[PDB]
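User: For a teaching handout, I'd like to show students what a predicted protein-ligand complex looks like in token form. I'll give you the sequence and the SMILES for magnesium ion. Please answer with just the structure.
Assistant: Understood, here is the input followed by the structure.
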Amino acid sequence: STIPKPSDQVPDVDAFLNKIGRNCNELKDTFENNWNNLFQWDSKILKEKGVNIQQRKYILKQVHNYRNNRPIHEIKLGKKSFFGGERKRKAFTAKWKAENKQ
Amino acid sequence: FSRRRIAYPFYPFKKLGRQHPKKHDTNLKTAMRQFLGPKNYKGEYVMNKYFTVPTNHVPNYIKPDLERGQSLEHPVTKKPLQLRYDGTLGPPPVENKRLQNIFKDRLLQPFPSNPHCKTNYVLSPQLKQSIFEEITVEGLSAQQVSQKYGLKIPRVEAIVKLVSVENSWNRRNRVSSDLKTMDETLYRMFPVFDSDASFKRENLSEIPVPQKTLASRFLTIAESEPFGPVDAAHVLELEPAVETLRNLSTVGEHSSGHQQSTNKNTKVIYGELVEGERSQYKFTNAKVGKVGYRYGSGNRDNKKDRRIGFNKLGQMVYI
Amino acid sequence: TCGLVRIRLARFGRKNSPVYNIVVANSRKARDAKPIEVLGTYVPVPSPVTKRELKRGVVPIKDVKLDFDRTKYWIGVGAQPSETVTKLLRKAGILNDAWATSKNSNVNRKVVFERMETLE
Amino acid sequence: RKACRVRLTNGNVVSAYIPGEGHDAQEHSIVYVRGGRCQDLPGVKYHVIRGAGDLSGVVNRISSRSKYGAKKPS
Amino acid sequence: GKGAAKYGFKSGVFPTTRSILKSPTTKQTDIINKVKSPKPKGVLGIGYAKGVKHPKGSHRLSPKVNFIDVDNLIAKTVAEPQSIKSSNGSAQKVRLQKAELRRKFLIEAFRKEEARLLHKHEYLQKRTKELEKAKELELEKLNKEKSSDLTIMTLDKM
Amino acid sequence: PRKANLLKSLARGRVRTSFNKYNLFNLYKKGGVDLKSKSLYQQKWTAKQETRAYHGEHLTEKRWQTVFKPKLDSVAQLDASLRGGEIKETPFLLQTFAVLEKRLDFALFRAMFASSVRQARQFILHGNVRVNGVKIKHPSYTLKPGDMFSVKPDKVLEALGAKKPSFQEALKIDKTQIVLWNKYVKEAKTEPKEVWEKKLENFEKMSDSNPKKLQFQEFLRQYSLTFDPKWAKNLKYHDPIKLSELEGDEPKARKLINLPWQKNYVYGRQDPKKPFFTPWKPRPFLSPFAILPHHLEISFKTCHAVYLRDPVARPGQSEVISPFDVPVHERAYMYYLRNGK
RNA sequence: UAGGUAGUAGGUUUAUUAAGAGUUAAACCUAGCCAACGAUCCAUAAUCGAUAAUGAAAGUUAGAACGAUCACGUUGACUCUGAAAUAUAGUCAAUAUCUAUAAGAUACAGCAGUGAGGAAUAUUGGACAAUGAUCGAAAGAUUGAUCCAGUUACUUAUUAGGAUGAUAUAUAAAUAUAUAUAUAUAAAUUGAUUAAAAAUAAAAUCCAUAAAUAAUUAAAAUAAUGAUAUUAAUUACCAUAUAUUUUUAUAUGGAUAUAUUUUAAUAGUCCUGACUAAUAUUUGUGCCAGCAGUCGCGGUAACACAAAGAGGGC
Ligand SMILES: [K+]
Ligand SMILES: [K+]
Ligand SMILES: [K+]
Ligand SMILES: [Mg+2]
Ligand SMILES: [Mg+2]
Ligand SMILES: [Mg+2]
Ligand SMILES: [Mg+2]
Ligand SMILES: [Mg+2]
Ligand SMILES: [Mg+2]
Ligand SMILES: [Mg+2]
Ligand SMILES: [Mg+2]
Ligand SMILES: [Mg+2]
Ligand SMILES: [Mg+2]
Ligand SMILES: [Mg+2]
Ligand SMILES: [Mg+2]
Ligand SMILES: [Mg+2]
Ligand SMILES: [Mg+2]
Ligand SMILES: [Mg+2]
Ligand SMILES: [Mg+2]
Ligand SMILES: [Mg+2]
Ligand SMILES: [Mg+2]
Ligand SMILES: [Mg+2]
Ligand SMILES: [Mg+2]
Ligand SMILES: [Mg+2]
Ligand SMILES: [Mg+2]
Ligand SMILES: [Mg+2]
Ligand SMILES: [Mg+2]
Ligand SMILES: [Mg+2]
Ligand SMILES: [Mg+2]
């Protein structure tokens, strides 16, 4: 679509790649701090630039959010419980309560 | 009793005699060279009576039975020539009476062994324009033009469709000299259609033969009871045959009676189209119990009768 | 989508050529299990328009067959359409803008063609 | 006629005819048995498959090679 | 398979169509009369004959059919909001619109179904009477004497 | 499809859907299918051999068996009883292979847009055929009544025209043509009276089959039919061609050639860019096979045709073009009905 | 397997359940109930279809695949919660394994995978883009459901090249248009000496397309998001205008040196005495070796064994 305008919280692409997170700060060299490249490159271009499947989809979701004045704060992917997944929690908990508290 | 049989000519030919050891010839090959005649330096067979196309609207179809395998004639005088002992070609000793009075039907029969196959008549460039100008300008119906020139309605409709394509081609100078040369040559190879000639006229009373009627039902009625086509139609639970013929004549796009409106009763909705949308939704009203893909339908993909179709772009698609 | 009675797409066809049944189904049953009712069919692939047609102004058409009356009955008794089915029903004019969401709300987009109900 | 007594993996003991000219079948050799009787040998109701297990294909077979476990000569 | 021939060569099945009205309505007079009709007795009868004790603990008669009043069904199922409540909220407005559409749809479904059922009974009655009249006419034509009948030998007196 | 091997063998003598020279001799010398002394199985097998050789040989036996339809379609003339002439029996069993006639490849052959069904398949596969304006590249596409199909003109001309000679092949024909022309100028000049006398006698036996006589009358108007010594003197000797000198140089070769009939172009290569013999002439042995179908309306000027209907059998005639008689087709039909049992 | 049954058959009452009933438990009565049109018992088996196979059909067969139903989640019983569970829960026990040695955990008939068994059945793959499901107000998170790809001719379908083509030289004055070109010379693979062929087969000639290359690029999905994917398809310097069923054609802007990317085609397998399609013969073996669905073949002219030639199927 159109190119949004830089804000004060997200002045440049590097700030954009740091707020979204998910290790997207490791693509700062792919974009070269070019604001237009971030808001013009689609999936096909990003795939040719070496961005993996998960990251390029995540970036494009945050680019759409920015274009619509929606928050771009990092949302973390889900993680299994400390005591393991439900299917292996009974076993893990039994072996963790006999080696920590006896 | 059956055995392998080399397809030797049924007619007499000069078989091979003693042969020099390196010729390695066959009796079939020598029989073909006798049928073909000498080959000139240009790679032609001028002595064969079939090498060149006819130019008098009379097809030159093979007549091996009537000429007993003698296919050679003089390229300009069209006088029979036969092989002699010297190895030269000369006049036959006795004229062939079977080749001078040939039946009219045989002249149009391309294959000697099949007398049920005959060539069709070519329509002259004038009759086509007349038919084109009557259906399009004068506004006559295909039924009238069909009953006038003795041509089946589908053929009449095809002539109009094809003449329209010839006008666009002639309007854009797309008909080249080669195409004109080829068209004229092929025109002079077929018997021209004559609307006046009764025998040349196509039968206009043909109807498809149904399957339920193909059986043979017999009724025992009183000795003086009248039973006619309409009564038979009631017995067979079919419309009268005359009605079928009349309904089949009103199918042509330019024929009288052509009507199609009883189906314009299905509610359709065209979804709103917004800027940026690449496609429009079309909704057609249906009834639960008829619409939908059935559950547990026979999968035929791994069977010899798997359904294969073609889309609007002509690409093969599985149905 | 919520509830026990949901209107959703059941997938038919072959690999790489999906077609869908519009069905009323129990939430807990398999996607392709025989539903309560089959309301219609959805072919997601638009009909291809020829080069001339494109310049002529023809837009590709996606074809949906639907029982309008039966569909309205199931909405009346509290059946809950899926998001994709909701989009289809809003385009057909059965559902209205009350079923739109914040992400797809076309509050400001020009209308090039207005919904037209015809007979064919 | 060359035959062989064979104990099948299901415990049934059968008599199988060895087809072809010459065979390298011995005791303890692993063989594959198929249906088909030897008409003139009563009680021999099965055939061993040439070119399977420890039974090699017929040596120098030219015709009907597939029936005798013979591979195609280059 | 061959079985498909019995169903128009349709392969596969559809779920059985549900009935919007699960019982007969109070406007299907024809059905109401049939249930009220006295139950037959004897060889082709139905029910316990006078003087025949029915099993102890069992109901002698069949339970009464429940006829649906569509006006009452609409009043209890999709009743209208009693007051014109103040839907100033964005979510209240959306809910009001959805409730209105759902009520409009279900009321049209119940009234169209009842109309269809009543219209179907009338069409069947008209169709049957036509068929009956046509059968009488057809039979009359068959019984009409033709001239060919003179050539059919007869022994009427015997 | 089935690989094309030994299709034109003279010993087998099978007739194919082609205009090939060898396929004409096989048809010329066949003399019917022999069914005498054979058992019922042998008769059916022979019928199958011959019919399938012609009707869809490229289709595999198993595919043909699926395509084969037991139902044959005929027409009933409702005026026959209103004519009075001796009625003819309908050849119902000549429709055994009618199901194939709706295939696009067969339709092209019947329209004479290709020299054989095999060539028709290649024309379709190479993108030269359109049906109703849409390019169809599947030879197995089935036509419906009313469908119009077209073939690129250059392909139809290359199929119905003579083969383009190569430069070397056509350069040796011009050398001989020059030698045989200088012989006619040496016999016309040594004894002009006899040559002209022979020339006049040749034009009497033309029969109007040879249009050269019509053209000759013009030439006699370009100069009573009495001898003229100016004719022999006008005749000039062409210059010999050194095949080696003008080898590999066509423009040079087509500037050293100037004959009364072939001027400034090598034999058959008037336009070497075209894919056929130039000037365009019909292919050899075209007359025996040139059959106009009853179920197609052809426009050769544009190379367009309309599929009017599926071929049908009528009293005394079958629209299915076949070189075999009804008894042969009857045996073939009996074979496929039972899957060759 | 000829007798079976003893809550067994029926009646009455209570308990229990939302609810009938020897359904369960308790009490009291009657002597019944099933059975040679097969009871009881034993064995075997998940069942079925608008599914698949076959047949002219009635039918028969299968129950993999698609769909419906039932049962089970190492084995048995019991209990809790709940509308509904003897739950893939809990409890106890049984069998096996494991580590943390506890009145412990695990049980791949979820996906992938391994060993075993067997004639025989695949990747320890990618993605949540699509369709669904769960959680959440939402943003979103999760999903071996699912969607894709991999392996495997297991099945089906399409394609897997058309036209022309029986020799080569030398040969011939010195443009009203010729024309049946004619002579010599050499060469000519296997078989065979003529109805004995292999064979238009090969090579060669003409013209193509696929692939490659280049540009372009849909659709699955849109508010955005495409795993598949090096997408399909199309176009052959690219773009544009005009005319132009299709399509074609002209002319233009930029682009290379008057023309404009390149360019193909190596099938196997069985069979040829009759049933049963296969006539062109020949060699070896000699009741041996072997062939064989049936009849049979083989003892020196083997149409049947083992081969060559030729031939017939798919
Ligand atoms: K029993
Ligand atoms: K998903
Ligand atoms: K073969
Ligand atoms: Mg035979
Ligand atoms: Mg009991
Ligand atoms: Mg009780
Ligand atoms: Mg008791
Ligand atoms: Mg079992
Ligand atoms: Mg069954
Ligand atoms: Mg069973
Ligand atoms: Mg399974
Ligand atoms: Mg369980
Ligand atoms: Mg259990
Ligand atoms: Mg448990
Ligand atoms: Mg297990
Ligand atoms: Mg597993
Ligand atoms: Mg094993
Ligand atoms: Mg397998
Ligand atoms: Mg593996
Ligand atoms: Mg995964
Ligand atoms: Mg030799
Ligand atoms: Mg390509
Ligand atoms: Mg998503
Ligand atoms: Mg995209
Ligand atoms: Mg053998
Ligand atoms: Mg011998
Ligand atoms: Mg044999
Ligand atoms: Mg042999
Ligand atoms: Mg051989």
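For the handout, you might add this sentence: Chains D and B do not touch (no CB pair under 8 Å).
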